[PDB]
Amino acid sequence: QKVHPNGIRLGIVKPWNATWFANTKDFADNLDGDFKVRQFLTGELKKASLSRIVIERPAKSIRVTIHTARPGVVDVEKLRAAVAKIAGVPAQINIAEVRKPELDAQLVGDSIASQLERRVMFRRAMKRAVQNAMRLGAKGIKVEVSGRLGGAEIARSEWYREGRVPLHTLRADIDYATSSAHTQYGVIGIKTWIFKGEILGGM
RNA sequence: AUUACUGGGCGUAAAGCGCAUGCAGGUGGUUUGUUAAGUCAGAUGUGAAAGCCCGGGGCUCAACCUCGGAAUAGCAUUUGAAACUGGCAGACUAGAGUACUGUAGAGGGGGGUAGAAUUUCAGGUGUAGCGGUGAAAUGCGUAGAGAUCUGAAGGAAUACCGGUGGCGAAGGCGGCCCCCUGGACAGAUACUGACACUCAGAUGCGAAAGCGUGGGGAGCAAACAGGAUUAGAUACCCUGGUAGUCCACGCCGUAAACGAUGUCUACUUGGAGGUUGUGGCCUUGAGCCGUGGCUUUCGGAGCUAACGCGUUAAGUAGACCGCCUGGGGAGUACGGUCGCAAGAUUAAAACUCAAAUGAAUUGACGGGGGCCCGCACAAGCGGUGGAGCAUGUGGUUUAAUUCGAUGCAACGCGAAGAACCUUACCUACUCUUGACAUCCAGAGAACUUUUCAGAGAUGAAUUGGUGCCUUCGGGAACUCUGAGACAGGUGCUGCAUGGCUGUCGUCAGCUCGUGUUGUGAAAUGUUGGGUUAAGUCCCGCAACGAGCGCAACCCUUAUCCUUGUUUGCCAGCGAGUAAUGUCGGGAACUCCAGGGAGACUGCCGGUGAUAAACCGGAGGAAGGUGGGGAUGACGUCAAGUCAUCAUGGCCCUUACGAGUAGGGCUACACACGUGCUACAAUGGCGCAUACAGAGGGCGGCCAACUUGCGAAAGUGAGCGAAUCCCAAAAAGUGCGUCGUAGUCCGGAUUGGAGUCUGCAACUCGACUCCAUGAAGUCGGAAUCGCUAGUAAUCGUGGAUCAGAAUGCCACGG
C-alpha cells in the first residue's frame, strides 16, 4: 500500500547510503561489493548499536562509515582489513556517533526487536520507545509491531503513534526502519517511523 | 425479593376481564354519647419433661451429662385504658342522590322522505369499436356496443358540511323530517342525610365474519370460472362471479374489542389549542375578563430499563377488583359448561430448551427517502465478439506436458524473453558428510596439458609446474580423501508468519484527547446553513482542540530572465566543397543545464450572509488544482506470494538431497481471455520527395568498401559517446497504375534453397529468397476503451537477451 519513507525522500530531504559514480560494467560489481560489506559489518556489529553503513568509493578505494551508538565497542583495524579484503581495494573505515540513539528509527526497532526476542510485552517495548523519543524531542513517532504477538496463533498488527508523522509531506524529515524479531512463534516485524520536523529549503 | 406478610409486579418484557350492572364479601365522610368486640396494659391459671438460648456445674479438653434462668410469641379467666376500628343510640352536610330551568350532541329505537350516483331495462340519436393493462388477453359490440338523450324500476349508501368536532359504558353512531326515548352538563334555590366505593360468583350489552328461518339483492365480493404473469402461480393483475354484504327475528360472544393503560377518590409547576355551558363588563365596537364540563398537544418535578408518561400520570397516596410468575408444548389435550353448528369458555401434563423477551446503541442491509460524485450512463468515436495468426488459461492428451496466479481485483499474469542451459518436471544413467557450508585430521601448491572409455556425469592412465611465507615439524591458500557433528530440499503449511503486493480508490474519509450528555452500549466533536475536487473553506453549534488522510512541499511540461558555450548552435561574418557549419570566426539564435521570475481568485465588475465561495472580465506563455506524474488514510477481502527472499512448525535425509544425458514445459477433439493482421480506393502498388522525439551501445553499436536477388558475408573504420554507431522515421506530399474483386485486397499454409546465433536450431529459433496464395467481403446476442494533444492512426527506441517481442515499458508524427 505505502511507499517507503526513505525511498520517496531520496534527493528531497533524505541522503544516500552509497555515493559512487560507476559506469555500467563496474556498477553491478560495486553494488555486490557493498552488499557483502554491509552483510559483514552488520553481522559483526550486532552488539554495537549499528544504524546506517554509508559506503563511498573515493576513486579506487572504499570508505565506510559505521554510524553507531557505540563508537567504543567498534577492532577497527580488523574491520578496515576485512572490508579491504571483500572490496579488494584499500579500505578506510570512519565512525560516527549516533548522539541521541533513541531518536534513530533503526536502533529504536533493533531495541524493540531485542526486547521481543528476550520475551518482553510488545506493548511495553513499543510504548517505552514512543515515550523516550517524544521526550528527546521527536516531533512524532509511530511504531508498528506485526506478527504472532505474545505468540498468538493468529498474527495481528498493533501500532502506537504520538506526535505528527506526516508521511505524504515530502519535506518532512521522517526516519524509517524495519527490524525483525526472530522468535519461537516466527518472525515479528518492527516498522518504526520518526518525524524529526519538516526541512524547509530542500536537501 | 423467582408466589414478594415482612418483600414483586401488569403501556411496550409474563400480566388490566371487551364493556358494564350488581348480590355475598372487602372498604367507607363528619360528629356526640355509650359499649368494650377488635386493640392496649396487668394479674391468675396453663403452655409436660427433653431440646434451643443465657449463666453456671461435672467429665484432662471437647462432644457428652447436668443445675438455675430465659423462652414456649398461645389460650382461658379476670381487672383496668378508651386514642383508633367495630357495635348501639343520636347528630351533621362536604360524599352520593332528588326537585326546578336551560344547553349542546352522528346517544338509542321506530317510521317517513330527498338528492347524487351505479346497475338493469325501454325508446331516440348514432357507428365501430368498447373495455381492460406494464403490455395484453379473457369479455362486450354490427343481432348496433361503447357514447349521448329521455324515461322506468330497483337496491344500497348518504358528496359538500366534516373537524386530533360531537355523542355513547364499551362495541359504536353521519342526508333531511317526525314520533318514542337514555345520558351528560350548567345555573339557581330547596330537599334527603353517608343512602357511598369496589366487586368473587351472577346478569346484561358486545365490531366483523359466521349460523337459523323468512325476505331482499343495485354495487361489491370469500368460493369459483376464464385470461394474463411465472420455472411453477392452487396468488398478486384483468374479465366474470356466488355466499355474504341489506331487512325481520333469533343464535354466536369473539377481535391489535387498543390508550395493548381496571374502577373510584384526593393531592402535586406550566404553555398553546378545540368544544359545550354560565356570570360580569361598556355590546362602550364582532370583544375582554371570570367560572364550570368535556377534549387535543407540548412540556416541569417526579416516575420509568429505556422508550416515554407527565393534573386526561405511567407522579404522590387510599379502597376494591382482575391478572402475571422462563421459552416451546399450549390457550392445546382431557373433563365440565355453553352453542344448531362454527366454536367459545374453564384449563393441564409428559417432554423439551438455556434461553425466550423489552427498550435502546453501533454497524450492515432495504426492490425506503433525500442529496451528491466517477467515461457510471447518456452524447459520440474506435474496438472485442466473427477470420487467420500470436499469446495466456482451461480441458484433454502425455512418461513428463513443472509450480504458482482464478469474479471484479487469474487468464500477453510470476516469466524484463523454456532449443541446451534456464528447469523446479520426465525417462535413463549416476553419488551419498554429499553439488553447496563450517569444523577436524592427514595428504597433495594451485594448475597444466593429452589421452582412452562413456550419452555425459565421472573414472583410470599423461606431461609441464610445484611458487608463497618462514616460528622455518611453520604461515597461507587451493586441490583431494577420511571422520561424524552436520549439509541440502523451488518439499508442506500464505489458515502459524515477516517482508512485499492487489483491491475499494487518490474514494474523502478514519479517529483521538479534553469537556459535555446518557444508568449504559454510546453520543457529541464529524451534525446543521452555504461552499469545495476534497471532513475544502466559511457561518452557525456543548463542544474545544488535535492526529492520519485532502491540499501544499517533489519530478515533468507550458513562458521569461540570468550564468556558460562543446561533442550542440550558425544571425551577422569571410573562405570553401559535388554538397556540406564544411571551416575561420560568432555567442546572436535553436538548444543544453545550473540559478532565478511567473498564477495568488492577486486585480476589476457582478452575486452571496458584509462569509466561504461563485459567475464573468483585464493582464498574461499560462486562470482559478494551468497539463501530466509521483504521493494510496484507518481498514476490507484468514485477498496474493513459504517458488525472490526470510521464517515457526512439519516432513525428507543412500533421498522429497546431489551430478549428468535425452525428452518436456511448444502436446491438441476443443472452449475462453488478451493481442496482432486483414477484409481494401480516406486503399494497394511502383517511383519521386519531406518533417521527429526518445533511447541504447564494448565479448558492444558497427560507418565505408566489395561480394550476394537477399538474409548476410567477407572486410574495415569510428565510438564508452550533444562527437561515432545503431539510424531508415512512418503515416505525409508529388506523379503514375490497379478499377473496385476474393482483386496489383489479404496474408495463412506448405514445398524447396539459404543465412545467422549457438557445442547444438529434429522435437522446438529468428531471418532471407523462390514458389505456394487458405480464412477473411467489416462481424449475433453481448461487450470494452476513451472527454484533448485524449481517442484513432503512424512509425521509433528500450529492458530481458547468445538467438528469439504481435507482449511490456517508453518516444514522438
Short mmCIF file of all heavy atoms in Angstrom, two decimals, chain B residues 386-397 401 666-673:
data_model
loop_
_atom_site.label_atom_id
_atom_site.label_comp_id
_atom_site.label_asym_id
_atom_site.label_seq_id
_atom_site.Cartn_x
_atom_site.Cartn_y
_atom_site.Cartn_z
P G B 386 -15.07 -15.12 -31.53
OP1 G B 386 -15.20 -16.58 -31.26
OP2 G B 386 -13.71 -14.52 -31.59
"O5'" G B 386 -15.74 -14.70 -32.93
"C5'" G B 386 -16.96 -15.35 -33.37
"C4'" G B 386 -17.09 -15.18 -34.86
"O4'" G B 386 -17.44 -13.81 -35.13
"C3'" G B 386 -15.83 -15.42 -35.68
"O3'" G B 386 -15.65 -16.81 -35.98
"C2'" G B 386 -16.10 -14.59 -36.93
"O2'" G B 386 -16.86 -15.30 -37.89
"C1'" G B 386 -16.90 -13.40 -36.37
N9 G B 386 -16.14 -12.18 -36.16
C8 G B 386 -16.23 -11.34 -35.07
N7 G B 386 -15.47 -10.29 -35.16
C5 G B 386 -14.84 -10.43 -36.39
C6 G B 386 -13.89 -9.59 -37.02
O6 G B 386 -13.41 -8.53 -36.60
N1 G B 386 -13.51 -10.10 -38.27
C2 G B 386 -13.97 -11.27 -38.82
N2 G B 386 -13.48 -11.62 -40.02
N3 G B 386 -14.88 -12.05 -38.24
C4 G B 386 -15.26 -11.58 -37.02
P A B 387 -14.18 -17.49 -35.96
OP1 A B 387 -14.29 -18.94 -36.33
OP2 A B 387 -13.47 -17.15 -34.70
"O5'" A B 387 -13.45 -16.71 -37.15
"C5'" A B 387 -13.90 -16.91 -38.52
"C4'" A B 387 -12.81 -16.59 -39.50
"O4'" A B 387 -12.75 -15.15 -39.68
"C3'" A B 387 -11.39 -17.00 -39.11
"O3'" A B 387 -11.12 -18.33 -39.53
"C2'" A B 387 -10.53 -15.97 -39.84
"O2'" A B 387 -10.24 -16.34 -41.16
"C1'" A B 387 -11.41 -14.72 -39.80
N9 A B 387 -11.11 -13.81 -38.70
C8 A B 387 -11.81 -13.64 -37.53
N7 A B 387 -11.32 -12.70 -36.76
C5 A B 387 -10.23 -12.22 -37.46
C6 A B 387 -9.28 -11.22 -37.16
N6 A B 387 -9.29 -10.50 -36.04
N1 A B 387 -8.30 -11.00 -38.07
C2 A B 387 -8.28 -11.74 -39.18
N3 A B 387 -9.13 -12.70 -39.57
C4 A B 387 -10.09 -12.89 -38.66
P G B 388 -10.29 -19.37 -38.62
OP1 G B 388 -10.49 -20.77 -39.08
OP2 G B 388 -10.47 -19.08 -37.16
"O5'" G B 388 -8.79 -18.97 -38.98
"C5'" G B 388 -8.38 -18.96 -40.37
"C4'" G B 388 -7.05 -18.26 -40.51
"O4'" G B 388 -7.25 -16.82 -40.52
"C3'" G B 388 -6.03 -18.49 -39.41
"O3'" G B 388 -5.38 -19.73 -39.61
"C2'" G B 388 -5.14 -17.26 -39.58
"O2'" G B 388 -4.22 -17.35 -40.64
"C1'" G B 388 -6.19 -16.19 -39.83
N9 G B 388 -6.69 -15.60 -38.60
C8 G B 388 -7.66 -16.09 -37.76
N7 G B 388 -7.87 -15.35 -36.70
C5 G B 388 -6.95 -14.32 -36.83
C6 G B 388 -6.71 -13.21 -35.99
O6 G B 388 -7.26 -12.93 -34.92
N1 G B 388 -5.68 -12.41 -36.49
C2 G B 388 -4.99 -12.63 -37.66
N2 G B 388 -4.02 -11.77 -37.97
N3 G B 388 -5.21 -13.68 -38.45
C4 G B 388 -6.20 -14.47 -37.98
P C B 389 -4.51 -20.40 -38.45
OP1 C B 389 -4.07 -21.77 -38.84
OP2 C B 389 -5.17 -20.24 -37.12
"O5'" C B 389 -3.27 -19.40 -38.56
"C5'" C B 389 -2.26 -19.44 -37.54
"C4'" C B 389 -1.54 -18.11 -37.47
"O4'" C B 389 -2.43 -17.02 -37.84
"C3'" C B 389 -1.02 -17.74 -36.08
"O3'" C B 389 0.23 -18.36 -35.90
"C2'" C B 389 -0.98 -16.21 -36.18
"O2'" C B 389 0.09 -15.73 -36.97
"C1'" C B 389 -2.30 -15.96 -36.91
N1 C B 389 -3.48 -15.95 -35.99
C2 C B 389 -3.71 -14.79 -35.23
O2 C B 389 -2.95 -13.83 -35.35
N3 C B 389 -4.76 -14.78 -34.36
C4 C B 389 -5.57 -15.84 -34.25
N4 C B 389 -6.59 -15.75 -33.40
C5 C B 389 -5.35 -17.02 -35.00
C6 C B 389 -4.30 -17.04 -35.84
P A B 390 0.59 -19.13 -34.54
OP1 A B 390 1.91 -19.81 -34.68
OP2 A B 390 -0.56 -19.93 -34.03
"O5'" A B 390 0.80 -17.85 -33.62
"C5'" A B 390 1.82 -16.87 -33.97
"C4'" A B 390 1.93 -15.86 -32.86
"O4'" A B 390 0.85 -14.90 -32.98
"C3'" A B 390 1.79 -16.41 -31.45
"O3'" A B 390 3.02 -16.94 -30.97
"C2'" A B 390 1.38 -15.14 -30.70
"O2'" A B 390 2.46 -14.27 -30.47
"C1'" A B 390 0.40 -14.53 -31.69
N9 A B 390 -0.99 -14.95 -31.53
C8 A B 390 -1.69 -15.84 -32.29
N7 A B 390 -2.94 -15.98 -31.94
C5 A B 390 -3.09 -15.08 -30.90
C6 A B 390 -4.20 -14.75 -30.09
N6 A B 390 -5.41 -15.30 -30.22
N1 A B 390 -4.01 -13.84 -29.11
C2 A B 390 -2.78 -13.31 -28.97
N3 A B 390 -1.68 -13.54 -29.67
C4 A B 390 -1.90 -14.45 -30.62
P U B 391 3.05 -18.14 -29.91
OP1 U B 391 4.47 -18.52 -29.66
OP2 U B 391 2.08 -19.21 -30.29
"O5'" U B 391 2.46 -17.52 -28.57
"C5'" U B 391 3.12 -16.39 -27.96
"C4'" U B 391 2.20 -15.79 -26.94
"O4'" U B 391 1.08 -15.12 -27.57
"C3'" U B 391 1.52 -16.77 -25.99
"O3'" U B 391 2.48 -17.23 -25.06
"C2'" U B 391 0.43 -15.86 -25.43
"O2'" U B 391 0.87 -14.84 -24.55
"C1'" U B 391 -0.05 -15.19 -26.72
N1 U B 391 -1.15 -15.94 -27.39
C2 U B 391 -2.41 -15.83 -26.83
O2 U B 391 -2.65 -15.19 -25.82
N3 U B 391 -3.40 -16.53 -27.48
C4 U B 391 -3.26 -17.31 -28.60
O4 U B 391 -4.25 -17.85 -29.09
C5 U B 391 -1.93 -17.36 -29.14
C6 U B 391 -0.95 -16.69 -28.52
P G B 392 2.30 -18.64 -24.34
OP1 G B 392 3.55 -18.94 -23.58
OP2 G B 392 1.78 -19.65 -25.30
"O5'" G B 392 1.12 -18.32 -23.31
"C5'" G B 392 1.39 -17.50 -22.16
"C4'" G B 392 0.10 -17.25 -21.42
"O4'" G B 392 -0.83 -16.56 -22.29
"C3'" G B 392 -0.67 -18.48 -20.97
"O3'" G B 392 -0.11 -19.00 -19.79
"C2'" G B 392 -2.07 -17.89 -20.78
"O2'" G B 392 -2.23 -17.21 -19.55
"C1'" G B 392 -2.14 -16.91 -21.94
N9 G B 392 -2.79 -17.47 -23.11
C8 G B 392 -2.20 -17.87 -24.28
N7 G B 392 -3.06 -18.30 -25.17
C5 G B 392 -4.29 -18.21 -24.53
C6 G B 392 -5.58 -18.55 -24.98
O6 G B 392 -5.90 -19.02 -26.08
N1 G B 392 -6.55 -18.29 -24.02
C2 G B 392 -6.30 -17.77 -22.78
N2 G B 392 -7.36 -17.58 -21.98
N3 G B 392 -5.09 -17.46 -22.33
C4 G B 392 -4.13 -17.71 -23.26
P U B 393 -0.40 -20.52 -19.36
OP1 U B 393 0.26 -20.81 -18.05
OP2 U B 393 -0.09 -21.39 -20.53
"O5'" U B 393 -1.97 -20.51 -19.14
"C5'" U B 393 -2.48 -19.98 -17.91
"C4'" U B 393 -3.98 -20.09 -17.91
"O4'" U B 393 -4.51 -19.46 -19.09
"C3'" U B 393 -4.53 -21.51 -17.96
"O3'" U B 393 -4.47 -22.07 -16.66
"C2'" U B 393 -5.94 -21.26 -18.47
"O2'" U B 393 -6.83 -20.86 -17.44
"C1'" U B 393 -5.72 -20.09 -19.43
N1 U B 393 -5.64 -20.51 -20.84
C2 U B 393 -6.83 -20.76 -21.50
O2 U B 393 -7.93 -20.61 -20.98
N3 U B 393 -6.69 -21.15 -22.81
C4 U B 393 -5.51 -21.33 -23.50
O4 U B 393 -5.54 -21.68 -24.68
C5 U B 393 -4.32 -21.06 -22.74
C6 U B 393 -4.43 -20.68 -21.47
P G B 394 -4.29 -23.65 -16.45
OP1 G B 394 -4.19 -24.03 -15.02
OP2 G B 394 -3.22 -24.13 -17.38
"O5'" G B 394 -5.74 -24.07 -16.98
"C5'" G B 394 -6.89 -23.80 -16.13
"C4'" G B 394 -8.16 -24.15 -16.86
"O4'" G B 394 -8.18 -23.51 -18.15
"C3'" G B 394 -8.34 -25.63 -17.19
"O3'" G B 394 -8.85 -26.34 -16.07
"C2'" G B 394 -9.34 -25.56 -18.34
"O2'" G B 394 -10.68 -25.43 -17.91
"C1'" G B 394 -8.89 -24.31 -19.08
N9 G B 394 -8.03 -24.58 -20.22
C8 G B 394 -6.67 -24.41 -20.30
N7 G B 394 -6.18 -24.69 -21.48
C5 G B 394 -7.29 -25.07 -22.23
C6 G B 394 -7.38 -25.49 -23.58
O6 G B 394 -6.46 -25.62 -24.40
N1 G B 394 -8.70 -25.77 -23.95
C2 G B 394 -9.79 -25.67 -23.12
N2 G B 394 -10.99 -25.96 -23.65
N3 G B 394 -9.71 -25.27 -21.84
C4 G B 394 -8.44 -25.00 -21.46
P G B 395 -8.34 -27.82 -15.73
OP1 G B 395 -9.04 -28.33 -14.51
OP2 G B 395 -6.85 -27.84 -15.75
"O5'" G B 395 -8.89 -28.61 -17.01
"C5'" G B 395 -10.32 -28.80 -17.16
"C4'" G B 395 -10.64 -29.32 -18.55
"O4'" G B 395 -10.21 -28.37 -19.55
"C3'" G B 395 -9.97 -30.64 -18.96
"O3'" G B 395 -10.71 -31.75 -18.47
"C2'" G B 395 -10.02 -30.53 -20.48
"O2'" G B 395 -11.26 -30.93 -21.03
"C1'" G B 395 -9.78 -29.04 -20.72
N9 G B 395 -8.38 -28.71 -20.96
C8 G B 395 -7.45 -28.29 -20.04
N7 G B 395 -6.27 -28.09 -20.55
C5 G B 395 -6.42 -28.40 -21.89
C6 G B 395 -5.46 -28.37 -22.94
O6 G B 395 -4.27 -28.06 -22.87
N1 G B 395 -6.02 -28.77 -24.16
C2 G B 395 -7.33 -29.14 -24.35
N2 G B 395 -7.68 -29.49 -25.60
N3 G B 395 -8.24 -29.17 -23.37
C4 G B 395 -7.71 -28.79 -22.17
P U B 396 -9.99 -33.10 -17.97
OP1 U B 396 -11.04 -34.05 -17.49
OP2 U B 396 -8.88 -32.76 -17.03
"O5'" U B 396 -9.37 -33.66 -19.33
"C5'" U B 396 -10.25 -34.22 -20.34
"C4'" U B 396 -9.51 -34.37 -21.65
"O4'" U B 396 -9.02 -33.08 -22.09
"C3'" U B 396 -8.26 -35.26 -21.63
"O3'" U B 396 -8.61 -36.64 -21.78
"C2'" U B 396 -7.48 -34.72 -22.83
"O2'" U B 396 -7.94 -35.19 -24.08
"C1'" U B 396 -7.77 -33.22 -22.74
N1 U B 396 -6.73 -32.47 -22.00
C2 U B 396 -5.71 -31.89 -22.75
O2 U B 396 -5.65 -31.96 -23.97
N3 U B 396 -4.77 -31.21 -22.01
C4 U B 396 -4.73 -31.06 -20.63
O4 U B 396 -3.81 -30.42 -20.12
C5 U B 396 -5.81 -31.70 -19.93
C6 U B 396 -6.74 -32.37 -20.62
P U B 397 -7.65 -37.81 -21.23
OP1 U B 397 -8.26 -39.14 -21.54
OP2 U B 397 -7.26 -37.53 -19.82
"O5'" U B 397 -6.35 -37.64 -22.15
"C5'" U B 397 -6.43 -37.99 -23.56
"C4'" U B 397 -5.17 -37.55 -24.27
"O4'" U B 397 -4.98 -36.11 -24.13
"C3'" U B 397 -3.85 -38.13 -23.74
"O3'" U B 397 -3.62 -39.45 -24.20
"C2'" U B 397 -2.85 -37.12 -24.31
"O2'" U B 397 -2.62 -37.28 -25.70
"C1'" U B 397 -3.59 -35.81 -24.07
N1 U B 397 -3.25 -35.19 -22.75
C2 U B 397 -2.08 -34.44 -22.67
O2 U B 397 -1.34 -34.25 -23.63
N3 U B 397 -1.82 -33.91 -21.44
C4 U B 397 -2.57 -34.06 -20.29
O4 U B 397 -2.20 -33.51 -19.25
C5 U B 397 -3.75 -34.86 -20.44
C6 U B 397 -4.04 -35.39 -21.63
P U B 401 2.56 -33.87 -15.86
OP1 U B 401 2.38 -32.55 -15.19
OP2 U B 401 1.90 -35.06 -15.23
"O5'" U B 401 2.04 -33.82 -17.37
"C5'" U B 401 1.62 -32.56 -17.93
"C4'" U B 401 2.83 -31.77 -18.36
"O4'" U B 401 3.43 -32.43 -19.50
"C3'" U B 401 2.52 -30.32 -18.82
"O3'" U B 401 3.44 -29.24 -18.57
"C2'" U B 401 2.27 -30.54 -20.32
"O2'" U B 401 2.49 -29.39 -21.11
"C1'" U B 401 3.30 -31.63 -20.65
N1 U B 401 2.96 -32.48 -21.82
C2 U B 401 1.68 -33.03 -21.92
O2 U B 401 0.80 -32.86 -21.09
N3 U B 401 1.46 -33.77 -23.05
C4 U B 401 2.36 -34.04 -24.06
O4 U B 401 2.01 -34.75 -25.01
C5 U B 401 3.66 -33.47 -23.88
C6 U B 401 3.90 -32.72 -22.79
P U B 666 3.56 -24.81 -22.60
OP1 U B 666 4.17 -23.59 -21.98
OP2 U B 666 2.08 -24.84 -22.79
"O5'" U B 666 4.27 -25.07 -24.01
"C5'" U B 666 3.77 -26.13 -24.88
"C4'" U B 666 4.10 -25.77 -26.31
"O4'" U B 666 5.46 -25.29 -26.37
"C3'" U B 666 4.01 -26.90 -27.35
"O3'" U B 666 3.13 -26.57 -28.42
"C2'" U B 666 5.44 -27.02 -27.92
"O2'" U B 666 5.46 -27.17 -29.32
"C1'" U B 666 6.00 -25.65 -27.61
N1 U B 666 7.46 -25.62 -27.52
C2 U B 666 8.16 -24.96 -28.51
O2 U B 666 7.62 -24.43 -29.47
N3 U B 666 9.52 -24.94 -28.34
C4 U B 666 10.24 -25.50 -27.30
O4 U B 666 11.46 -25.41 -27.29
C5 U B 666 9.44 -26.15 -26.31
C6 U B 666 8.11 -26.20 -26.45
P A B 667 1.79 -27.39 -28.71
OP1 A B 667 0.84 -26.51 -29.45
OP2 A B 667 1.32 -28.02 -27.44
"O5'" A B 667 2.25 -28.54 -29.73
"C5'" A B 667 3.25 -29.54 -29.33
"C4'" A B 667 2.59 -30.80 -28.81
"O4'" A B 667 2.48 -30.74 -27.37
"C3'" A B 667 1.17 -31.12 -29.31
"O3'" A B 667 1.22 -32.24 -30.17
"C2'" A B 667 0.37 -31.45 -28.04
"O2'" A B 667 -0.37 -32.64 -28.17
"C1'" A B 667 1.45 -31.61 -26.98
N9 A B 667 1.04 -31.25 -25.63
C8 A B 667 1.83 -30.70 -24.66
N7 A B 667 1.20 -30.45 -23.54
C5 A B 667 -0.10 -30.87 -23.79
C6 A B 667 -1.25 -30.88 -22.98
N6 A B 667 -1.27 -30.43 -21.73
N1 A B 667 -2.40 -31.35 -23.53
C2 A B 667 -2.36 -31.80 -24.79
N3 A B 667 -1.34 -31.85 -25.64
C4 A B 667 -0.22 -31.37 -25.07
P C B 668 0.33 -32.28 -31.50
OP1 C B 668 0.56 -33.58 -32.19
OP2 C B 668 0.53 -31.02 -32.28
"O5'" C B 668 -1.12 -32.27 -30.84
"C5'" C B 668 -2.26 -32.03 -31.70
"C4'" C B 668 -3.53 -31.99 -30.89
"O4'" C B 668 -3.25 -31.63 -29.51
"C3'" C B 668 -4.59 -30.98 -31.37
"O3'" C B 668 -5.88 -31.57 -31.35
"C2'" C B 668 -4.49 -29.85 -30.35
"O2'" C B 668 -5.69 -29.12 -30.17
"C1'" C B 668 -4.18 -30.66 -29.09
N1 C B 668 -3.60 -29.86 -27.98
C2 C B 668 -4.19 -29.93 -26.71
O2 C B 668 -5.17 -30.66 -26.54
N3 C B 668 -3.67 -29.19 -25.70
C4 C B 668 -2.60 -28.41 -25.90
N4 C B 668 -2.13 -27.71 -24.88
C5 C B 668 -1.99 -28.32 -27.18
C6 C B 668 -2.51 -29.05 -28.18
P A B 669 -6.43 -32.44 -32.58
OP1 A B 669 -5.85 -33.81 -32.55
OP2 A B 669 -6.39 -31.67 -33.85
"O5'" A B 669 -7.93 -32.50 -32.03
"C5'" A B 669 -8.87 -33.39 -32.65
"C4'" A B 669 -10.24 -33.16 -32.07
"O4'" A B 669 -10.29 -33.65 -30.71
"C3'" A B 669 -10.71 -31.72 -31.92
"O3'" A B 669 -11.08 -31.12 -33.15
"C2'" A B 669 -11.90 -31.94 -30.99
"O2'" A B 669 -13.05 -32.41 -31.68
"C1'" A B 669 -11.35 -33.00 -30.04
N9 A B 669 -10.85 -32.45 -28.78
C8 A B 669 -10.19 -31.26 -28.60
N7 A B 669 -9.91 -31.00 -27.34
C5 A B 669 -10.42 -32.09 -26.65
C6 A B 669 -10.43 -32.42 -25.28
N6 A B 669 -9.94 -31.64 -24.32
N1 A B 669 -11.02 -33.59 -24.92
C2 A B 669 -11.56 -34.36 -25.88
N3 A B 669 -11.60 -34.15 -27.20
C4 A B 669 -11.01 -32.99 -27.53
P C B 670 -10.89 -29.53 -33.40
OP1 C B 670 -11.85 -29.07 -34.44
OP2 C B 670 -9.45 -29.22 -33.59
"O5'" C B 670 -11.33 -28.92 -31.98
"C5'" C B 670 -12.68 -28.40 -31.81
"C4'" C B 670 -13.01 -28.25 -30.34
"O4'" C B 670 -11.97 -28.85 -29.52
"C3'" C B 670 -13.09 -26.83 -29.79
"O3'" C B 670 -14.29 -26.14 -30.16
"C2'" C B 670 -13.02 -27.12 -28.29
"O2'" C B 670 -14.22 -27.65 -27.76
"C1'" C B 670 -11.94 -28.21 -28.26
N1 C B 670 -10.57 -27.67 -28.02
C2 C B 670 -10.05 -27.70 -26.72
O2 C B 670 -10.74 -28.19 -25.80
N3 C B 670 -8.81 -27.20 -26.49
C4 C B 670 -8.08 -26.69 -27.49
N4 C B 670 -6.87 -26.22 -27.21
C5 C B 670 -8.59 -26.63 -28.82
C6 C B 670 -9.83 -27.12 -29.04
P A B 671 -14.32 -24.54 -30.34
OP1 A B 671 -15.60 -24.14 -30.99
OP2 A B 671 -13.05 -24.05 -30.94
"O5'" A B 671 -14.36 -24.04 -28.82
"C5'" A B 671 -15.52 -24.35 -28.00
"C4'" A B 671 -15.38 -23.75 -26.62
"O4'" A B 671 -14.43 -24.53 -25.84
"C3'" A B 671 -14.86 -22.31 -26.52
"O3'" A B 671 -15.88 -21.34 -26.70
"C2'" A B 671 -14.35 -22.30 -25.08
"O2'" A B 671 -15.37 -22.22 -24.12
"C1'" A B 671 -13.65 -23.66 -25.04
N9 A B 671 -12.29 -23.60 -25.58
C8 A B 671 -11.88 -23.89 -26.86
N7 A B 671 -10.60 -23.70 -27.05
C5 A B 671 -10.14 -23.22 -25.84
C6 A B 671 -8.87 -22.82 -25.40
N6 A B 671 -7.79 -22.85 -26.18
N1 A B 671 -8.75 -22.38 -24.13
C2 A B 671 -9.85 -22.35 -23.36
N3 A B 671 -11.09 -22.71 -23.66
C4 A B 671 -11.18 -23.13 -24.93
P C B 672 -15.55 -19.90 -27.35
OP1 C B 672 -16.83 -19.18 -27.61
OP2 C B 672 -14.58 -20.03 -28.47
"O5'" C B 672 -14.80 -19.16 -26.14
"C5'" C B 672 -15.54 -18.85 -24.93
"C4'" C B 672 -14.58 -18.43 -23.84
"O4'" C B 672 -13.59 -19.47 -23.61
"C3'" C B 672 -13.73 -17.18 -24.11
"O3'" C B 672 -14.44 -15.96 -23.96
"C2'" C B 672 -12.64 -17.38 -23.06
"O2'" C B 672 -13.06 -17.16 -21.73
"C1'" C B 672 -12.36 -18.87 -23.23
N1 C B 672 -11.31 -19.14 -24.27
C2 C B 672 -9.97 -19.06 -23.88
O2 C B 672 -9.70 -18.81 -22.69
N3 C B 672 -8.99 -19.27 -24.81
C4 C B 672 -9.32 -19.52 -26.09
N4 C B 672 -8.33 -19.72 -26.96
C5 C B 672 -10.67 -19.59 -26.50
C6 C B 672 -11.62 -19.39 -25.58
P G B 673 -13.98 -14.62 -24.73
OP1 G B 673 -15.00 -13.54 -24.52
OP2 G B 673 -13.54 -14.91 -26.12
"O5'" G B 673 -12.67 -14.22 -23.91
"C5'" G B 673 -12.80 -13.94 -22.50
"C4'" G B 673 -11.46 -13.50 -21.96
"O4'" G B 673 -10.57 -14.64 -21.83
"C3'" G B 673 -10.67 -12.51 -22.81
"O3'" G B 673 -11.14 -11.18 -22.70
"C2'" G B 673 -9.29 -12.70 -22.18
"O2'" G B 673 -9.17 -12.12 -20.89
"C1'" G B 673 -9.25 -14.22 -22.11
N9 G B 673 -8.81 -14.83 -23.37
C8 G B 673 -9.57 -15.43 -24.33
N7 G B 673 -8.88 -15.82 -25.37
C5 G B 673 -7.59 -15.43 -25.08
C6 G B 673 -6.41 -15.58 -25.84
O6 G B 673 -6.28 -16.12 -26.95
N1 G B 673 -5.31 -15.02 -25.18
C2 G B 673 -5.34 -14.40 -23.96
N2 G B 673 -4.18 -13.93 -23.49
N3 G B 673 -6.45 -14.26 -23.25
C4 G B 673 -7.53 -14.80 -23.86
#
